[PDB]
């Protein structure tokens, strides 16, 4: 009964790491999507 | 940070394993004693059987 609370208190640290990773993934998606779409818009009809 | 948390979790799991082993051994000894008690009680009362 003394060991159990230690395992309980271990958990929250990992969830914060997962949340931060999700935020990083969303920001990365936005940045790379914008870059790719901008490049495709600029390079369109450049073979004229 | 996640690696640190997992390492702590593994240490706690090892401690739980040790606790479980100690509990199993002590319960085995207790069951042996209770079996002795039951054998004594069953062998008794033959005067009253």
From TrEMBL, chain A:
<protein>
    <submittedName>
        <fullName>MmpL5 protein</fullName>
    </submittedName>
</protein>
<comment type="similarity">
    <text>Belongs to the resistance-nodulation-cell division (RND) (TC 2.A.6) family. MmpL subfamily.</text>
</comment>
<feature type="coiled-coil region">
    <location>
        <begin position="15"/>
        <end position="46"/>
    </location>
</feature>
């Amino acid at each position: 009964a003394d060991l159990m609370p230690r395992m309980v208190a271990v958990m929250p640290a990992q969830i914060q790491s997962m949340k931060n990773q999700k935020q990083t993934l969303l920001n990365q998606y936005q940045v790379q999507k914008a870059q790719q779409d901008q490049n495709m818009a600029m390079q369109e009809n450049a073979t004229a | 940070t996640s690696i640190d948390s997992m390492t702590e979790m593994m240490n706690i799991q090892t401690e739980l394993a040790a606790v479980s082993q100690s509990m199993a051994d002590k319960m085995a000894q207790t069951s042996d004693d209770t079996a002795d008690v039951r054998d004594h009680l069953a062998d008794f009362d033959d005067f009253f059987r």
